[PDB]
Design a protein around this ligand. Sequence first.
Ligand code: NA
Length: 639
Amino acid sequence: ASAPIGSAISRNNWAVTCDSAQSGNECNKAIDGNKDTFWHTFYGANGDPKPPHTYTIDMKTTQNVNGLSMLPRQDGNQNGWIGRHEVYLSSDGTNWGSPVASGSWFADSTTKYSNFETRPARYVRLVAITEANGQPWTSIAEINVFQASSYTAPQPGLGRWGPTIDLPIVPAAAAIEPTSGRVLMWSSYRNDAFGGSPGGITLTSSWDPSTGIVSDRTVTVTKHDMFCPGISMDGNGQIVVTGGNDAKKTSLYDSSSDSWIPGPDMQVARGYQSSATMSDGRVFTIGGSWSGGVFEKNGEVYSPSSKTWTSLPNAKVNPMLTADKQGLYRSDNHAWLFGWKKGSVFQAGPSTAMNWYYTSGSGDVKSAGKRQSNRGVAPDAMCGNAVMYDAVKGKILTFGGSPDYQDSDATTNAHIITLGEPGTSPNTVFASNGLYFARTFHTSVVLPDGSTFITGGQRRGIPFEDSTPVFTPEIYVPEQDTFYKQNPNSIVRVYHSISLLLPDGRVFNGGGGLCGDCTTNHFDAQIFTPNYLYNSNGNLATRPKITRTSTQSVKVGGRITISTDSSISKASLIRYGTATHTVNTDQRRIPLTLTNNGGNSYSFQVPSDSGVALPGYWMLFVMNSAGVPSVASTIRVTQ
Ligand code: NA
């Protein structure tokens, strides 16, 4: 199950309108209180009018709406089950504006919801754009509207949440398809659960920011249930998904062909391990005792060229283990890994102990010291996040998490780690005064400007429970060494949520749950629009445009020339991300130094070090003096 974010509104006084209704299947059947009676559009003898179909509610009064429920026809028949939909609010009944929520509902008879940010409204409208099976009708047994306890206008200058994207599944794993710009999400063998999988199947779903279409697809070709895996975008631009429910499998997603390809089996079966792309396009993985057994799982490395997994037994997991109470089952999970110089992998935590992993010969691991500051040695921060916001200066921001995977209090601790040469002890200091809010299970993304957006989580880690939620996101401004609270959202994002940067510079935040019958499944996502996209008036700012790119594929050391429509002040490269269970080893930012060629023409050099400019796909963003970013240009960086 799922749940609405508010309280059901009294349907006493309501006035409802439909595009059609078959006698017996009248509009009002939908708000009668009887799950046995439903509204149904014309059929048979009345004809079969295709969708869109519409349900308009006049609540007669103004309420703080925050959601809606749609209980499908419970008579064993599928006819009229809403797939694609859009929800609109209106204070007047004429001017609706943009949908507050849209996406697709899974084809089943469970109550479906639309949770959205609170908005004062008198009129509601649900548009059924499609029928779950491609049929013409639309049926609704019961429809409810929810209200917030109160309404608080988002404050100016602190970004905005919305709209909500409804999905058929809990997006507990997501990636950005670099070629398409689509957000790819996967759950498990089921749309709402992982437990009891026969393995070999994965439900996936894609959201296209450009069209707003949510398209779903079952993957079986790779004979893998991709729940609880390792994710890395290799040197080739292919997404490497490893283990999880099918502990030894590897599945390869090729954005280019929009296809899933079976990969080689890992040497060791793992679940909940982290994997990281190396300076040579290879993928390194270590740990993962959630599945495939609980024992010391040393490193192994994947060669996209030979399509082999090679064990690196001397790349020892032991030094990176946290002191988790549940033991190894959790202690080797979600390592904060970063591919660095010369085939090295840096492990920034969660363990207090940081380490250098080497991939030559049978591997090696060297101690890089302890995460600490003037405030002390940092404790284990299981499920804390780690973001490399300046790969040129080797700057990594770390924050939140807790000593144990669950039933532990989250921290406010935040640190800056500055990496040097592999084998050396990096410098670590405290970040400002730490987070405004302790959190675990939160997610984060590095934005075009080098700031880090941090959202969701809870104060105390209790998987599948929406307790002690943090609704206030924070942004860390490196230049200022300051954290800034942003406008709060309304939907809890704890265990199993994700965040990804979209090519347009907005953040996609979604998921949480995946616990079957629980009422904590969130079959949605929301868009956060950072303040850099607005002007003072609260309207959207005008964005520089990249009118030209000399090439869309460059070698490390390579030079790119672009023309813009306006004079640009700054530019950055951001590696395409992948995310699951707080881990995102693919994203990183490179601040570029621009050569002003006159006539709004500029050139920049891509770092010559493939351990900085890890190969794969990147997004190029230009900023005007105002600080407004362009939408990204996609650049393939090859070694
Ligand atoms: Na009814």
